[PDB]
Amino acid sequence: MSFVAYEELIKEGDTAILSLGHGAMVAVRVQRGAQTQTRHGVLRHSVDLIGRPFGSKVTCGRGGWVYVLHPTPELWTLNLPHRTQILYSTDIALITMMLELRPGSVVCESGTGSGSVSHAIIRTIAPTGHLHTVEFHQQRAEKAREEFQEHRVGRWVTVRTQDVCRSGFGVSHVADAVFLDIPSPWEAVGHAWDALKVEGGRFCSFSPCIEQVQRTCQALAARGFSELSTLEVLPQVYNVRTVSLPPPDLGTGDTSPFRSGTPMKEAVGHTGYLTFATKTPG
Amino acid sequence: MSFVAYEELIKEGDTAILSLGHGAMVAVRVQRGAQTQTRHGVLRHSVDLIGRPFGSKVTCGRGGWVYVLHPTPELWTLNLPHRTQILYSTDIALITMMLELRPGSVVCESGTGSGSVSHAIIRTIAPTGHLHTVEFHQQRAEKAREEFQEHRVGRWVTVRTQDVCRSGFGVSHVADAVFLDIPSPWEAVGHAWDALKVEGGRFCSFSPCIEQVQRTCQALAARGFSELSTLEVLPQVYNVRTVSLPPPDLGTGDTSPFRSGTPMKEAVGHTGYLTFATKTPG
Amino acid sequence: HRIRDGDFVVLKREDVFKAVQVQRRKKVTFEKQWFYLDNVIGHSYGTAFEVTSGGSLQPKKKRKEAGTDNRNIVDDGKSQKLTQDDIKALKDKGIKGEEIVQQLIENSTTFRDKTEFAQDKYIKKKKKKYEAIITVVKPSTRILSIMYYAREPGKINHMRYDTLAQMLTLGNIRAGNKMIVMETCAGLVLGAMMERMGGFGSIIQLYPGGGPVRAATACFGFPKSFLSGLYEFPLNKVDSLLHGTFSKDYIQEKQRRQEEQRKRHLEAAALLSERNADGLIVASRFHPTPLLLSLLDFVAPSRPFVVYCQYKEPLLECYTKLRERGGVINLRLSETWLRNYQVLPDRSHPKLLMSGGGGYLLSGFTVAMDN
Amino acid sequence: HRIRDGDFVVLKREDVFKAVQVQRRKKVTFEKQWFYLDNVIGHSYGTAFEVTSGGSLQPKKKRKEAGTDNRNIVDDGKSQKLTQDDIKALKDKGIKGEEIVQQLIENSTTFRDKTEFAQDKYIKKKKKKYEAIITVVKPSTRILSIMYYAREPGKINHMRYDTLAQMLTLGNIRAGNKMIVMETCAGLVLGAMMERMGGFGSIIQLYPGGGPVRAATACFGFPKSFLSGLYEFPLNKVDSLLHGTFSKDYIQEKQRRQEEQRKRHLEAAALLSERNADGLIVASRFHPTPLLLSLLDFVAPSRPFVVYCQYKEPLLECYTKLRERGGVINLRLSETWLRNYQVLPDRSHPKLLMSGGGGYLLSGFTVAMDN
RNA sequence: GGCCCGGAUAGCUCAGUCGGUAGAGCAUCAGACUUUUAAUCUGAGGGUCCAGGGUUCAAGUCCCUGUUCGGGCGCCA
RNA sequence: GGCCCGGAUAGCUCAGUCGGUAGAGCAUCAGACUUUUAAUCUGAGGGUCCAGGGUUCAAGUCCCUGUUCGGGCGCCA
């Protein structure tokens, strides 16, 4: 830790990310007296982790080893316990820039879900900004509050357990940005307008289905939102390999090898459409 | 010519395709006494074209030259006079395979438009197949008939001037495949079913807007069509270039060049969604 | 027309395909089940089936309160009021399957509280697992190319089906052509070419090793008549051909196939030497550049050629070397991406974008060389 | 808050952007028109404007029979009953523009026979050309990155805006960091980093030539306070630094900037030599491999780095060489594609798929070297 | 006499018969340098496509006219 | 005693601390070859992910249990 500032040394209470080879990782809460088993052996926190610097190669058991990495929202996103489907960093990167988030930004979010987007926002708006997030599911709301305390970011976030479509975000005319990830975002557009400052701000909604987008855009226009833009961002990831295609035998008595960037998957899926808009006075 | 069979030598009445450098091309109707001007000079058909083999380098005027290519549907698609927006060969390739078109196939089409798809179908279903196409715009219908006669493919195609959504394709239970490119294809689904053989066949509709697709799929399901699949195919084209990135100056006293396939355009557009379905007895 | 014994066919379950030849009293596996095809006959193609002990039976072709939110839905793990043990019981008892679905629904406390969409989804997921329905369909390039790309993509060098479609179109494959093909795609490209030529014209297949692979080709169930114009010729003799420097009871059977194959090779060699082919299609595990530079010599002017490669880099070289050799025009290095869509009321969206793992194409037209 | 003189701003018309600094009595061009910015002041951002002789005026923010088919619509060319000459007349007469639209509609014989959608489209196309509305907006990474990619992509090595977004996230750019950047993207990447750091922390910019380019950076209109933590250091002295082998009235003004710049260079050199940086961002016209292999030494363990390149091939090499050097983990070679959508009643579809011409990224985390 | 082809984006002017129009040059500005009513080298800033109309599905690789630069044929359409 | 990790797709059996699970081997079959109740080389055919349940938006890089293979800690949770 912290999620919000880099520290050299691992300490108790920290969330540490272990790299296990390939891309595989696991998140661990560092406690004295605690043990963590990996395919490379056991880690005893009190001697193998605590006091040691992030980025170190840590020997485990029978000469096995792992690397320990400092926590970040991106690493957390890939290791957090899902209580919902979550947004990944490719969508989050675009959301963050297009909402114009920066230190000092005040942001409204619903639904909190599993906090993947929440941690990214907090990292971005700290130390002066604040996140007002909303989750109508009691347990998910409380689990999010617990994590925020564990990760020492409670200062920057308030979770309200309520229906954003009926009761809104719990604040009025304070936000620079609103982010929606819920099944019926068109029912929250008016509350988004009320949550954003009178001077204006930015809006973004994430929907898997085009009919949800359509309803959202219709509601945005009717309420006075402008600069409507609907986008989709698609990640492609490449393996770096050397390949050699054998020369054909034509009976004779160039075909040199090459480096290639081959996609890791033959198909890239759909996460959601991202609809952006702007609120301006007038 | 012909569009339907390769011939060695250019003859009068032929549609010849001139390649002018880069990717640029122009289609010409070969007539005795006719002249064609290009950026490379004049071509006098009676001596420069007629009697000469396709694929030849033809000198024009002041030592300028062009290549003359044998006509094909793909080349025609890129050189035909638009009377409508047309489908290009990437969509046509998928349409052709997914409709299971082959020699002997009987096909129903609407709307004829500019005949881009029509010529591809004819090329595919000849010599035993037949195309029954429908165009409710009088002039476009007649222009299509003219072209079919000029290109000597009238045997394989019948153009009917009528509204496919009210009067259908003009045939019943004879077709192996139906292809739709019109604004309101959901109104032609019943007629597509009636046009396809009782034993069954294939259906495809091309729509730019997702709401058109939705209506089509709903009508297909209600009428008894099965195996519904909606696809989109996106062409990417690459320039082959050698590039060299200059080495940075770090104060010192590898960065070797490389071949790259760079896209010709930074953005690939949307033509349409392609919705396929199957008719089976039951 | 209708299904018959001996027929080559394709089995379909959901979007999964498997091709097989029908045979009385033969056992085959498909998606975790054991079959007997005997029963599926005299039925139209597109006809459905269900499994039993080991035999298939013909089923008909064709066959409300809810909540709004999940805000109060808790995962206790105890929503389904029947056990993992009970479940096998209903199955071993050999019950329908649809009734098992109905039973699972009735014993789901949360089902009624779920959204309509979540209900639909819950049911579709159960039907998929318990109501296993097998459709029998006719082989076609469409079905076989989709099947291979999904089932054995390594065997066809990861050539996606939309890519194969582009090749057939770019190569102006049609009835009457004299075509040349070099393929290590199990004969799938050959079969696709044969479908579009309809028994009209000729195909000369250049093969590596001791013979051409045609396993995929056999799945099409072509008439014998399509074989008359089908020739083969060993790739290792090609260099000779271009220079003109080219030449108890079963020990007999061999000699009979050897001279007969030698015979066919000479016919093929003659057709090639005419150097008047209407096109060239290449799609193999071998580096394509040398194949192209040699095989193009067999092709007439003003004819299309298409080279497939799983990788882009080799086509970049092939492009440059074709430009050194000359004799080509309108060179185009291309790739297609393919996106599929879920289209349902209030639930429409893209599913997969197939990209980069479906191959690349280098295409163009031949022209006369300078002299 | 509200617009003021001296303010750096961005002009917007449709989706076209141009950044400019407001100045009393200065003339600027935008989309084929001549302006005077004097009039746009005291107005909120997002406020609209129209042009006149040379001055802008504030307009309000906001402001039926038809056929079914085109089966009988013929292109005679004579649908518009007023001439190409008449048209200039209405314009030279300096008429509103909306009335010219209304006039064109009234003199279109076919308009009433067109579909509603075709009508809407006809009107939008006319309004675009005659009702030129200019909005003034506040600079942000979003707006400037979109502008540059559209207006001057060659200046930023064709780095698309979604790609820039990935870099900021993958590099965990945030307040408090000590960041290192080497950019020849006009200072756009620097500006983006400065926006996300909010004046907290430090940035060390390595520059080629005689100084860092910050033209784009200036468009952001940052407070002077953001400059205190902004350092620069010449790239050609980096090798020395890693080895430790590193050292009338205007002729005075120069000496004043030279020693002051020498001063700042030494501070920057010190911060670098601590080798404890929180990340590294590279995006330039130069081959990236040597930049990375050298500049990483300045970065602390367990820190993210991101390298941009317009081309993939050099990142393939950089990947292999990073794996030889060691000291890195979770290496990822990536690219983003971006699709935009038209979302309107009964007329929804994708517009453009931005692919391949937006660049590639190689990212990972630093780790401790083996000893 | 007319006809047929091909071009117009940066303040100005250009851009290839490989399916080469976000690629440049001039000029301007800045650094460095010395030769200073300034030169030289290096680099930077500057791009949304000539106007108007008509048409295609609710996606233009569409058409016509005008302005202007250029190429070609020949008194023929 | 228990606890913690990681694996199950082809008829069978495997698959790497580089963000390596459509990649193979065995066996089988075929060609070629000679050494022939057969050997050898080459090649081909064979892939949809262990079962069951619960959950996420109307997109899983989600969770639990059972079966079975393996790794580790230690009588502690």
Ligand SMILES: Nc1ncnc2c1ncn2[C@@H]1O[C@H](CSCC[C@H](N)C(=O)O)[C@@H](O)[C@H]1O
């Ligand atoms: N009307 C409403 N008010 C508050 N929360 C709602 C809501 N409708 C749906 N939700 C919540 O929205 C969440 C959607 S999942 C959100 C995931 C989140 N973006 C992440 O990355 O972690 C669910 O937890 C659901 O409980």
Ligand SMILES: Nc1ncnc2c1ncn2[C@@H]1O[C@H](CSCC[C@H](N)C(=O)O)[C@@H](O)[C@H]1O
């Ligand atoms: N109901 C209808 N009946 C017949 N033709 C129709 C029709 N609705 C639209 N059309 C015709 O459909 C055509 C659509 S454009 C078709 C282009 C064609 N696919 C090509 O590639 O050349 C138009 O010419 C239009 O006149």
Ligand code: NA
């Ligand atoms: Na100009």
Ligand code: NA
């Ligand atoms: Na197994």
